[PDB]
Symmetry: C4
Subunit: 369 residues, 4 copies
């Protein structure tokens, strides 16, 4: 049965540890892939960790956009190894989600001026999208959002240090049935974290051009969209300035470059996942700002520590658990964090929102390099 | 279908070898986890070995309460390897059981003053329990007991060398529906081995404070509890004095510290699993005392050898096979023994009670260190 | 349910990347088989990569027609390893297909003067064919074609540098129900790539004797056959001359030896997969010739690059995805390419025909030898 | 559904290769168990290779009746590795079969004077048999035979160089319902290969005492037994004299010691599997003697080579494929051969009887030691 996607996110007061793979620590001895850009997506049975291999193992001489890059997947918490990974697609940029029946896998491969997204429904190639700007066609590196048998994603074509072109897709059974281009001047969308919420999709993305806060786009199933920036003075991107008065436009200070991130909108509130360090991808914390989606101030109410400030962090993205998997009446918000080491490789930790008691700690990668 | 849990333990005269993994012997060459505190729990289909990894492999430079510790599981008798282990939870103290529908996993992680138990039902986080004494919240390191769709566990918070606080939980579908604190002055409960028996639960635990006999707590589904010590002069803990006249207050002699153990109450009798050595965790034997639950004498009738006195042993715990798995009219009592080597790592052997003919032997770990 | 096989190939304008295993790159560190002659076949659930192991691993002292050669299989895109490969048959020449119910595996083993094909239906030996010329009995090294519960293959017995004997088989549930010998003087058929197309089978094969174009044989379910050569001046075999005027007979120039290949007939058109280099097995491209099946000219309309001319290629073969797997109204044409390295070992890439937008690139093996 | 076991063996004219694992060749690099005494048994879905591990891997310093010995199993043709083996029982002598519902596993462990057979039905301990002579209780090292939900085996207790005691068991759902002791003076039964045939069981065994021909015992489901020797002058055991006039008392010449073997009775005929060498366990051949079960002469009609005389062979045993697995009207006879290398370890090859065309060859282990 298709995931309905019509329930709301239920409110959460903290984040509870869900998975940790210990990939690099195991890969010091075992045969473990060199992976980058991991993300989590859940079927109505299980959650799976998706990752981009380089086609190489840790502690080997074979260890950005190469033809050897493939999207693979393992059960959540298991180490990514060639003996337990399932192949998904050839991809140096990827997205994947489950509509309640089968997996949809989106894999981008090809040259920088001619990249093509290959869409797979239950392992069968069902559609392709070619690059429309011929400057690095790229996608979420996180799970697409599925509402009522339609899955949705955001793709970006154009420069990563300037104005690019952003497209929203509706995908039914692996087939593109509607695409719209976002008219967003002075905005910049990269590597969006998208989640379903009451038949709507909300994406929170990376402004690599000139934004140290995070842009967002929300749209309905007919892809009528709204855009804006997260107005909180608690800035989400990395690099970023120290916390100050925010704005609902792109904040210029330390706005160049960035990191893939996420946020969860709760009315006017927002749960913000961000690095602890404002200069490097070090540490991770979750911050509850009861007015941060629209209000410019730098006052919050809850801060939970995820990764210690002296430990390496990286990409972070959102994923959801639908009521068809949990049996609840709401959609549970969850997120993953990539812990980048170094070769360059990464492990992953994942958290889910709960209303019960939580604690902060540091769950770092822990490999002795 | 939920496990009923209303049949009684059937009487057994001996213990028959069920599984042996040979973990360290294999891990000299293969990629095998460094594991500690293994335990066994059975679904209506199969039995599974649960274990705490350190996130490290044998014969590697990465080899108590760390954020890298995770609860994992393998089919019984198989070596714990990253290529065949299923991830369960992040945990440096754990418990797990199957109510007949899905697995319930309890995983404790966090700091010593702020640890939180994360409860998972079919891989979904369903509840959390925060520490109420802020001194190392800890649990069974063995299977919880499930009666009629409710699973039960005992948790301890407080000092391990003095009076602590002990709580009994009732858990339905991963949700705590009733918890009670045990009023047990001069008692000390650690790492309880709990089993169902005629709709009631019996736990036999470790007195780390001052007790060389083993404390016990029994309770019904509404958590009305009774407490006591095992009165037999055949003492169960390790370290322990030589066998003498017992009591069922806590026996002070060699009472400090201890080892996780188990016992099976049969009316007034008791099957006692214990180390052969009274000073170290060496050897293992099963002793049938027909009056040992209530009587203070040191006379028994059956002794079966499990591990030889010159071989290393360790933690031991109980698990059961419900009639829904065996097709019998009784609940079969079974137990595992951890064989600790050294890094510090452990293999496991497991036995099940039968009324047919048995033999004693030594089934040690066998790795040449 | 049996695959009907009665729909036609749907027209395609390009080829989209489907799988890439990165076998040798992984096998530099992991335990990966030394494999040769891989091919792909799909069940109504999944596609599988079949391969001939030498019974040896990469980077080992143990690394054509040996008794240690076995046919094995893995899920598509996964590395061929002894820990995830399924054993299929003992074979130094093989074919395999799925009729919609069970796998049919054909495995040839034995001496050069006495080889016997062993037919297996769902792992059970169901029939054998002995050699009728006693000079290396051999088969497709690609998937057999199944129409309406009957699977079809072509076998060759006799010299590979001269006139041999070619037989077409009809196989129902692993049992040979009809075989016919092809009366084909001056023709030479080796390692045929066969596909179903509207209840009929079309095979495109290798002329190792005197042909640099590719011979073909088409037949109905009663094995009434037609034969010919692909008339296009775009020659398909390797070694081959430079493109010139073709012929519907065997083209003598550079006609000796060859490589296993494929083609897809579309009325009078043909999709030709071939090496880029005319002298060695280097590179790969797909060429659309709208009249190439019957017309002798060297003019085409579409050329898509698959493997770069400086990268090693090898055997190529065809496979299909039936409507019972894709849910479409047509049979999707697909092909694989073996990338040969060096020991001698090979990885594999695979493509499927689509009518959407595609790009050319190079997806080579990538191992640093 | 239970296997009926009431059809007859259908006549076969040759033996076709079924599986070959290439264990030692792979284990030079990969993590492959050191195994001994492999055997094959088939469920109504699949066939499985059962083997006794030493709890040690090839190419490791950890590499007869030890407590570390365990019965494990893999799918047929796959290498025995800790990452794909299923644990079955603790055992230094074993037997296993499938009654059509679940696996029955028999595992003998314990000391030489106190060994106990542990019977497991679907992984649950269901019965035990203790040693009745206290001199190495031992069993088939091959598959038990199941007829109509009852599985049958032969066990031996007593000296291996003299008169011992032999018992036939009937086992229903893992429970012994009838055992009978064979009154067999001057006979010696070791490591019987038993097969069902028209609701009756026939076992062909090893005379380690004074017999170079092979003893046999046949019995119905009520264990009314008949005994004898194979009267053919084609002797089956190894060591053995050169072929001469036989008898069906025990043939004294070279009668001491032996090797586990098998034979298939076809009325008065017999298919004899035996080593080529009369002094060592070298080579293997299958010999059809149309009167060899009862007639003393040394004339046969068919000889098929299995393993070359310069290659190592070892234990050989029989297994069957029931009509519920093949869909045929008869029970297909099949056999395996262990190829012993050296540590001491072994690979396995397996053959099934067919009435189609076969060839002889050598399929040796092939590891370069
Ligand atoms: C700005 C997004 C994007 C623009 C192309 O770059 C991504 C890159 N994505 C791709 C498709 O290569 C990803 N592999 C990881 C990155 C990273 O670690 O920051 C980014 N790299 C740089 C140099 O910013
Ligand atoms: C007394 C129980 C408990 C009190 C905290 O200590 C456990 C410990 N449990 C935890 C939660 O760390 C466990 N890993 C193993 C132990 C062991 O091998 O004896 C114990 N260690 C010591 C120093 O006694
Ligand atoms: C001409 C086909 C065939 C004739 C016997 O030879 C095949 C060979 N097939 C067999 C059955 O051995 C295959 N392993 C690979 C080949 C290759 O890489 O070209 C061929 N080898 C040579 C020397 O041409
Ligand atoms: C005669 C059967 C039996 C009598 C005890 O001995 C078996 C042995 N079986 C057991 C139970 O150990 C088996 N592992 C392999 C043997 C072998 O390779 O020949 C035999 N060994 C010797 C010394 O003959
Ligand atoms: C979502 O829709 C389903 C039917 O599609 C309905 O049963 C359910 O109540 C809806 N839930 C909410 C929260 O609106
Ligand atoms: C346990 O309860 C079930 C119903 O829940 C009943 O059928 C069964 O007989 C009971 N068993 C015992 C041993 O009391
Ligand atoms: C193929 O046969 C089936 C019957 O199984 C029929 O329904 C189908 O329409 C046929 N295909 C075409 C293209 O007509
Ligand atoms: C075997 O038994 C089944 C029923 O158990 C019966 O249908 C079948 O005819 C029997 N076969 C023979 C050959 O007796
Ligand atoms: Ca930025
Ligand atoms: Ca104590
Ligand atoms: Ca040629
Ligand atoms: Ca003998």
């Amino acid at each position: 049965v298709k995931l309905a996607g019509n329930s709301s996110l239920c409110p959460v007061s903290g984040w509870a540890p869900l998975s940790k793979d210990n990939s690099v620590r195991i890969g010091s001895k075992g045969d473990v892939f060199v992976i980058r850009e991991p993300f989590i997506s859940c079927s109505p049975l299980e959650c799976r960790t998706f990752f981009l291999t380089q086609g190489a193992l840790l502690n080997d001489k074979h260890s950005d956009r190469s033809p050897y890059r493939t999207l693979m997947s393992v059960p959540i918490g298991s180490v990514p190894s060639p003996y337990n990974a399932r192949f998904e697609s050839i991809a140096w940029s990827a997205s994947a989600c489950h509509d309640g029946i089968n997996w949809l896998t989106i894999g981008i491969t090809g040259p920088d001026n001619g990249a093509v997204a290959i869409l797979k429904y239950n392992g069968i190639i069902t559609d392709t999208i070619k690059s429309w700007r011929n400057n690095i066609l790229r996608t979420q590196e996180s799970e697409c959002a599925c509402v009522n048998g339609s899955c949705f994603t955001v793709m970006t074509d154009g420069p990563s240090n300037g104005q690019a072109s952003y497209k929203i897709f509706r995908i039914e059974k692996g087939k593109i049935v509607k695409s719209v281009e976002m008219n967003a001047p002075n905005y910049h969308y990269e590597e969006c974290s998208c989640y379903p919420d009451s038949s709507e999709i909300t994406c929170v993305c990376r402004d690599n051009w000139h934004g140290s806060n995070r842009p967002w786009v929300s749209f309905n199933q007919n892809l009528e969209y709204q855009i804006g920036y997260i107005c909180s003075g608690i800035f989400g991107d990395n690099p970023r300035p120290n916390d100050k008065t925010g704005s609902c436009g792109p904040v210029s200070s330390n706005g160049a470059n960035g990191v893939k991130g996420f946020s969860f909108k709760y009315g006017n509130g927002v749960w913000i996942g961000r690095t602890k360090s404002i200069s490097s991808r070090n540490g991770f914390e979750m911050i509850w700002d009861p007015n941060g989606w629209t209000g410019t101030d730098n006052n919050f109410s809850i801060k939970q520590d995820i990764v210690g400030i002296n430990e390496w962090s990286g990409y972070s993205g959102s994923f959801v658990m639908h009521p068809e998997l949990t049996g609840l009446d709401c959609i549970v918000p969850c997120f993953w964090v990539e812990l980048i080491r170094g070769w360059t490789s990464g492990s992953s930790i994942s958290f889910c929102g709960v209303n019960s008691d939580t604690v902060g700690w540091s769950w770092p990668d822990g490999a002795e390099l």
